[PDB]
Each structure stands twice: as C-alpha cells, then as structure tokens.
Write a protein that binds this ligand. Structure first.
Ligand SMILES: CS(=O)(=O)CCNC(=O)C1=Cc2c(ncnc2Nc2ccc(Oc3cccc(C(F)(F)F)c3)c(Cl)c2)NCC1
Length: 317
C-alpha cells in the first residue's frame, strides 16, 4: 500500500524498447503486482549509471516526491526497483508524446487544441512549483497524451536525481538538454522554477511549429553565445505577435522578469477563449482530430500478443 512501491524484478517485464535519452532508456512493459491477478501496462525507465552513485536511501527519498504528485496534468511514479541499475515504473501512456502527436497530426490540429495544451502544461508546472520540485527537463518530448484534449508532464526531477547540478556528472561525460535550458542553467547550473519557465517557452515553440527542432543545425556548444547576443527562436508562422511575445518573455535573461506559471495559466486561458484571434491556421474551423485509438502510436504499442489481458492503471488504482 506504499505510495512509492518497491517492485521486485520478478514483478515486472520489459517487453520492447521505446528509446534512449540524455538521462536514460525507456521500455514498454507489464507490471504484475505480486499477490494480485492482473497485468498492468507500464513504461519502465532504466537510468544511466555513475562512477560515484548516490546511496539507495537518497534515491528512494527523491523518488518519493515523484510518487507523491497528484494532479491531472502531471504523471506520477508508481514504483521503483533498485538493483545494479535504477528502474522507474509508471503508467504506460499509449498515445505517446505530444511532440510525436503534433508532428503526426499537424494538418488536423486547430488553435483550440494547441492553446488548451499550453494551459494544461502551465497548470502541471504550477503544481510542481507548489510541490517545490524543479522539473529541469521540460520539453515537448516530456509531455504525454492521455487524450487529444488531456496532456500530462513527465520526467521531472531526474536531472536533480542524477546530479546534473554538480560538476561531477558533467566531468563524467553526462549531457544535458542545452537547447531547452535557461542561460543561467547553462552557465552556472542554476535551476529554479523560472528556469523551467524558459524551457516552457521552448516547449510552446515546439508545439506551435508542429514539432520543429529548436536551433536546428546549430551546434550545442554555440548556444550560450547565441543567447548572449540576444538571438532567440523565431516567431512560428501560425502565431500572432501576442503569442510570440509570451514565448519571448519566457526567454529573458533576467529570470525574475520572466512570466510565472500562474500568470501563463491565466494568459493562455484567456486566449483559449478566443483561439482564432491568437493563432492563424488555414482551415482552422474545419479541423477534425482522428479517433485517438486509430492513431498509429496506440496500435503499435497495444496490439502485440504479449499484451494479453490487461487493466489500465487508472482503472486498477
Ligand atoms: C523520442 S523517444 O523515442 O526517445 C521517446 C521514448 N518514450 C516514449 O516513446 C514514450 C514513453 C512513455 C510512455 N508512457 C509513459 N511514460 C513514458 N516515458 C517515461 C518518461 C519518464 C519516466 O521516468 C520518470 C522520471 C521522473 C518522473 C516520472 C513521473 F512518472 F513521476 F512523472 C517518470 C518514465 Cl518511467 C517513463 N508512453 C509512450 C511514449
């Protein structure tokens, strides 16, 4: 009945690889709670190791905060398994990430959906700020689709868990998502809720460009000098200046001057009330989102025979 379940290796199975990232590698899997008689679809993240790793109790302590979160727009940790590696277990979101979703469905996404996503992301980030948990890796890749009209943030607090605020991580070959990072994070490893704001601006940009790569082609080693010269991501073609100004504010050098998440919830909520005033999308009025389960991503994950007879984590808990 633990908030953070300590799962035995025998309790869960990695079924297929999803992909790798800076902080680790994710798998589709099944969780079979020990005494019970159900199979629950889970994502399983196995982390990158360190030469001088943290003690288990310290890892458990940070993971507890990740399991403690209770908000509609934030994913929560269901379990953890410590061995020679750290493995994190969470409810599988089979519609996939919002980044893949905008890239796939560009021609059917209207202004209402895009603005509603921005609100939802800002609400989840405001909830993390209430929990005093800096995300440190907000990006469109770390926003997951529950339904086309409901998205959730994941992967918060991992950069802290892995020691990316200290020099040792970086000296030992560790990498961080530079093209999403506030300038003060790049230069001095400062991470606050206001550095998350910057990464929020980048996320919104990714959304409004239907999943373009920020500073595409520009080497990561050149990013700090580019930012220092005042250069920023360009206005997305669909955005009025009112919307781009918000993104621009999120990337001010003075972190204290950037909008707050509580402010962004209000501003994007006002825009979502009159979406066609703020985003200019051809055919906006006549745009229909495909049935969520008819998406390629969902079928690709769930139709496998290994996924025999399963119960959604929401229905089980
Ligand atoms: C570009 S790619 O190909 O590399 C993308 C690779 N990933 C994918 O395709 C997908 C992954 C995917 C998913 N459902 C559910 N979680 C997922 N990932 C994921 C992400 C992070 C995780 O660790 C946490 C770390 C800290 C907090 C939390 C917590 F939970 F508290 F928020 C979780 C864990 Cl365990 C899983 N569904 C499919 C989409």
């Amino acid at each position: 009945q633990a908030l953070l379940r300590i799962l035995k290796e025998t309790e869960f199975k990695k079924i297929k690889v999803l992909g790798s990232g800076a902080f680790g590698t994710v798998y589709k899997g099944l969780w079979i709670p020990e005494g019970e008689k159900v199979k629950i679809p889970v994502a399983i993240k196995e982390l990158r190791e360190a030469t001088s790793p943290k003690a288990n109790k310290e890892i458990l302590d940070e993971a507890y905060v990740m399991a403690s979160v209770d908000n509609p727009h934030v994913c929560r940790l269901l379990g953890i398994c410590l061995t020679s590696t750290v493995q994190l277990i969470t409810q599988l979101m089979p519609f996939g990430c919002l980044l893949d979703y905008v890239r796939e469905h560009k021609d059917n996404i209207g202004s209402q959906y895009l603005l509603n996503w921005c609100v939802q992301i800002a609400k989840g980030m405001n909830y993390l700020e209430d929990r005093r948990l800096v995300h440190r890796d907000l990006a469109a890749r770390n926003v997951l689709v529950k339904t086309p009209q409901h998205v959730k943030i994941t992967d918060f607090g991992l950069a802290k868990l892995l020691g990316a605020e200290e020099k040792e991580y970086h000296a030992e070959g560790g990498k961080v998502p530079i093209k999403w990072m506030a300038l003060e994070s790049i230069l001095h490893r400062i991470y606050t809720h206001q550095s998350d704001v910057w990464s929020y601006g980048v996320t919104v940009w990714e959304l409004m460009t239907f999943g373009s790569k920020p500073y595409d082609g520009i080497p990561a080693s050149e990013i700090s000098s580019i930012l220092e010269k005042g250069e920023r991501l360009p206005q997305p073609p669909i955005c009025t200046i009112d919307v781009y100004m918000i993104m621009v504010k999120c990337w001010m050098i003075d972190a204290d001057s950037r909008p707050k998440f509580r402010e962004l919830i209000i501003e994007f909520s006002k825009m979502a009330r009159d979406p066609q005033r703020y985003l200019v999308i051809q055919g906006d009025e006549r745009m229909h989102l495909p049935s969520p389960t008819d998406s390629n991503f969902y079928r690709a994950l769930m139709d496998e025979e290994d996924m025999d007879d399963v119960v959604d984590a929401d229905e089980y808990l």
